């Protein structure tokens, strides 16, 4: 299922307008409608937009979507404290038997403090782990605000399919956030490729680290 990519974080001060992007492929956004959902913790997703900027009754006029060739955007004008949630774009997909694909999600935060860029420390697999017929790369992210990032792993500058596990961001002592991601490989996969890269994306800044077996 070609997954719809979304920016990890969208922010603004009260009253400002905030737009959310959603990028898709030919099989999902080039042929089907796009829905926008408001996701709150401990409850169901609230359907905001359906059928390209139509919205059901009860949804304020502050929300409005739009779809292009293969891209959609949501618009939240006049941001309010009650708009902090995880917003998702979902679209049907003409793949094998028909797949409902969700977007990666975008955390909307009202600015409590200035934005902080993340720090990234990458750790390659230990020799002790390689002797145990295993391999794990550790990518540490810290000191970022708001609490949302996208961690994408690369193997020889090409994206990695599976093996990635990322924690949700968590608030540390100084009101900024931290998170970690892990890439599990077999020893052959590690020694085979030339490099492996951890690419962290956060509010229009990107930090990429790389490690190599040799």
């Amino acid at each position: 299922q070609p997954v719809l990519t979304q920016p990890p974080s969208a922010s603004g001060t009260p009253g400002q307008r905030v737009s959310i992007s959603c990028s898709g492929s030919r099989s999902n956004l080039g042929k089907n409608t796009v829905n926008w959902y408001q996701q709150l913790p401990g409850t169901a997703p609230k359907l905001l937009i359906y059928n390209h900027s139509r919205r059901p009754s009860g949804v304020p006029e502050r929300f409005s979507g739009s779809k292009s060739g293969t891209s959609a955007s949501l618009a939240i004008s006049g941001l309010q404290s009650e708009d902090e949630a995880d917003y998702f774009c979902a679209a049907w997909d003409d793949s094998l038997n028909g797949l409902y694909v969700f977007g990666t999600g975008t955390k909307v935060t009202v600015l409590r403090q200035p934005k902080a860029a993340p720090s990234v420390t990458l750790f390659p697999p230990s020799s002790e782990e390689l002797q145990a017929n295993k391999a794990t790369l550790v990518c540490l992210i810290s000191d970022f605000y708001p609490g949302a990032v996208t961690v994408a792993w690369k193997a020889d500058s090409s994206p990695v399919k599976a093996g990635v596990e990322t924690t949700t961001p968590s608030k540390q002592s100084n009101n900024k956030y931290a998170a970690s991601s892990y890439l599990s490989l077999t020893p052959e996969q590690w020694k085979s490729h030339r490099s492996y890269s951890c690419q962290v994306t956060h509010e229009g800044s990107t930090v990429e680290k790389t490690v190599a077996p040799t």
Binding site: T33, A44, P45, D86, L96, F102, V138, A178, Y182
Partner: protein, 217 residues
Amino acid sequence: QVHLQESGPGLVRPSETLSLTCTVSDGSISSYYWSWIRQPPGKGLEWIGSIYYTGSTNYNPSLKSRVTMSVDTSKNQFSLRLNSVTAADTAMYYCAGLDRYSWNEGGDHWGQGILVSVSSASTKGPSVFPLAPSSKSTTAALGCLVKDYFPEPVTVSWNSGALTSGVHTFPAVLQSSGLYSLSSVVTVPSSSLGTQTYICNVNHKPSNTKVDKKVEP
């Protein structure tokens, strides 16, 4: 006045079957593509699958091996059963009626969602590996990787509680395999790499495991 209601045990055992039903009131069992979605606490939304009242089934390939969805035309319900549940299946599950063809005004319709947690009575010891410094000559960082342990609370000390300033223990991740892994890193001056020795003390009491790792360059 259309309404979906989820129902089922909000608590369950591993290797059992996760059962959930959704009753549809004020709607035709033929008017929608009845779907199940889940969001694991922290992670994103995952479409489990979609069933039609005739029997047309469509399963997420990541879950197809152990998902079975059904529909009761008489009781106006539709069900979802998920075999081989692990802790990675603890999630908020929701039924919806997805509009496949944009043929309904008012769009898709949704239930209220229910947080289903799976409780397991088993344990598994952690595998501990050291995260080596690889000298940087300018406040280096070195850590301990605690991997693949099931019951959640592990506690990580450094030099038996001597080393306090610079200790940062990143929270555990819940892998798709149902096991937890975390990292605890400390930041130490580069000059002290060769002289002062650093040992992390991983304590996982549920499995009665204690591990001490000397982390040296």
